Amino acid sequence: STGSATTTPIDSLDDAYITPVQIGTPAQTLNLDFDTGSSDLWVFSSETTASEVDGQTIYTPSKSTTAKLLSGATWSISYGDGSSSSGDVYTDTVSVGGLTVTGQAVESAKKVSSSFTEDSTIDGLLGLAFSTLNTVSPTQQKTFFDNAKASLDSPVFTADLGYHAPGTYNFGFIDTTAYTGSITYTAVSTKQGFWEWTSTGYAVGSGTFKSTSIDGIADTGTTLLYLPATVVSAYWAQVSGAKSSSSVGGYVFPCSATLPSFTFGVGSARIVIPGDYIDFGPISTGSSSCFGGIQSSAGIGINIFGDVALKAAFVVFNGATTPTLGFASK
């Protein structure tokens, strides 16, 4: 089997992407944030504290003839941005772009933190990291990809995120029309539960490539590109007036600037992030200070190849017995 679904930016900055997902019988369609950095499929629901729902579409398990309470199971998750959610668990039929999994754990939110409530466009998350990170207790649950894998024509999914435009998540096949040149594959460590890999270096603009190993994660659920402070300083030093602002929470730059590109290495290959992809607009409405799309990872503990990086590429998440990542230009 295969599936193919369009993913759409939630706003004019590409802060996140939503993909429609069919849950239950008859189908209830929710727009989920596909997140290769976590491993829980959770939704706003009829059980979510009413004051914490503000415009989201909810899953109502009592209206699904295929929903079953997963008795005793609870979940609770905290994300790198400080947001969180928790609740109980149902199993139900879940379909993405024509690919159907029966018996998928659908984690129903009883509580969500304010940033989720405040984002009316995201009805939940669909985790695509390794199932060892799933938070369901006392019986850990599998991701949608892990449950679908055996049925797929090939044990892969691909992320093709657009810049200010829709893109595609495919399951079970590699669309050879969706990229240019060849796909370069690189080793993955699953030891932390992430799609963790080592970039071979970077360049800023038209500058020379610096060969240096940068371990990080491919994370579709993180907006920006978080890299070591040395690398980020070298980038922003090329932008007149750019500075790190403790009050704003990262590097800012004059909105009048033209940003240089940023290149990252994948083995001997190179992925070029155009300068425009690194512009996240005014820090507050009407400001002439703009927020940078490349930020230091020094306070995180891990480097994160988020959407800023991934949307410059066609990305293969290869879930073979030894997982690997593939990157192609597009």
Swiss-Prot record:
EC number: 3.4.23.22
MF terms in GO: aspartic-type endopeptidase activity
GO biological process terms held by the UniProt record: proteolysis
Active-site feature positions: 35, 199
Top EC class, one word: hydrolase
Catalytic activity: Hydrolysis of proteins with specificity similar to that of pepsin A, prefers hydrophobic residues at P1 and P1', but does not cleave 14-Ala-|-Leu-15 in the B chain of insulin or Z-Glu-Tyr. Clots milk
Disulfides per UniProt: 255-290
Residue ranges of every copy of the Peptidase A1 domain listed in the record: 17-328
Record keywords, A-Z: Aspartyl protease, Disulfide bond, Hydrolase, Protease, Signal, Zymogen
Family of this protein: Belongs to the peptidase A1 family.
Protein name in the entry: Endothiapepsin
Residues of the whole record sequence present: 90 to 419 of 419
